[PDB]
Design a protein around this ligand. Structure first.
Ligand SMILES: Nc1ncnc2c1ncn2[C@@H]1O[C@H](CSCC[C@H](N)C(=O)O)[C@@H](O)[C@H]1O
Length: 327
DNA sequence: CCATGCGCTGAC
DNA sequence: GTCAGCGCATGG
């Protein structure tokens, strides 16, 4: 993450829904805001959140009375993507997991915060020929909010990971905000090779497979693109090997293969997967965030999370526009 | 719970 | 053609 000097959101309040690791919370506090409610139902994620933050989130959002929820200015939410991802079966609103959106709509109708901040995957902008996206725009409008949505790639905001996601910012109409803008892109100056741990700490992750088929040569100079070097097996998800002189592929939560969830990389002569701490870094997490003791649960957790740095750039802009009140 | 082999979709 | 994906489905 990046350090913010102008704490533009001092004094405002927010809630962390579908918390996971608390990425939306690290980002929003670096700007001065206060968290007054969190919700997340997974046992293991509740263990890490409490360990880093010291409070335990409520559970199941579907059986919580929206009238118990504390007053708040900003509502934050990265909802489940499985029923929208380009990796699954694409069932959408018909899926038991693809309806969580209407629970946010319930909370919003009763509490009416100043701002609504949501995140989801790339395919969500196109799914169902764009109808799925239009159901969200039209609902937020009916509730009396404006609607801003864009796809941003992390490699354009300083982190070397090819992660494309859709971000949705919404403002209540009596505030008359007319100058919100998405942050502007810049050049990448950090590559995968600059974030790895010493060879003595990742030796147990080294993999010597005999069906290794190198299909490209190691590159000489750094490039802000994923450069594939080889394959194992048939070369499906989890069997592709990449160069450390470029950028990392998207981490996932339920992925498989011999190099499950992180991808394989050619490091100092041998192919291996990424360590949890290295996963933290490619997502923008500080070295002081304490990871879960179960390696398995940690990989899953970083797979479902958001890149802190990108959230930090967006939150400053939300603040700049809210603080512009001339005579 | 944990690991690993898929086999299809989308955006060029 | 070419390549990448906050995943699915079965085994102990
Ligand atoms: N019904 C529900 N009630 C509470 N939490 C739920 C839920 N349904 C799904 N979740 C949680 O929804 C989360 C979505 S991904 C959240 C990641 C978060 N943005 C980050 O910074 O970590 C998952 O962790 C899942 O465990």
């Amino acid at each position: 993450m990046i350090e913010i000097k102008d704490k533009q959101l001092t004094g405002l309040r927010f809630i962390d829904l579908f918390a996971g690791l608390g990425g939306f919370r690290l980002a929003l506090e670096s700007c001065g805001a206060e968290c007054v409610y969190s919700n997340e139902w997974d046992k293991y994620a509740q263990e890490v959140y409490e360990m880093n933050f010291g409070e335990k989130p409520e559970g199941d959002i579907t059986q919580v009375n929206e009238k118990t929820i504390p007053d708040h200015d900003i509502l934050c939410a990265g909802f489940p993507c499985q029923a929208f991802s380009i990796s699954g079966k694409q069932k959408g609103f018909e899926d038991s997991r693809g309806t969580l959106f209407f629970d946010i709509a319930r909370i919003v109708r009763e509490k009416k915060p100043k701002v609504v901040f949501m995140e989801n995957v790339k395919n969500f902008a196109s799914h169902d020929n764009g109808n799925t996206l239009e159901v969200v725009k039209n609902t937020m409008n009916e509730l009396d909010y404006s609607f801003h949505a864009k796809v941003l790639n992390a490699l354009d905001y300083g982190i070397p990971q090819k992660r494309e996601r859709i971000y949705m910012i919404c403002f209540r109409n009596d505030l008359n905000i007319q100058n919100f803008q998405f942050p502007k892109p810049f050049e990448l100056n950090t590559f995968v090779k600059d974030l790895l741990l010493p060879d003595s700490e990742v030796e147990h992750l080294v993999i010597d497979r005999k069906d290794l088929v190198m299909t490209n040569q190691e590159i000489e100079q750094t490039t802000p693109k994923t450069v594939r070097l080889g394959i194992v097996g048939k070369g499906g998800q989890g069997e592709r090997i990449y160069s450390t002189r470029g950028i990392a592929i998207t981490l996932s939560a339920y992925g498989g293969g011999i190099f499950a969830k992180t991808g394989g990389y050619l490091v100092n002569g041998k192919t291996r997967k990424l360590h949890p701490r290295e996963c933290a870094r490619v997502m923008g997490y500080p070295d002081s965030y304490k990871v879960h003791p179960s390696t398995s649960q940690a990989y899953k957790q970083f797979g479902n999370s958001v890149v802190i740095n990108v959230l930090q750039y967006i939150a400053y802009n939300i603040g700049s526009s809210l603080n512009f009140k001339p005579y």
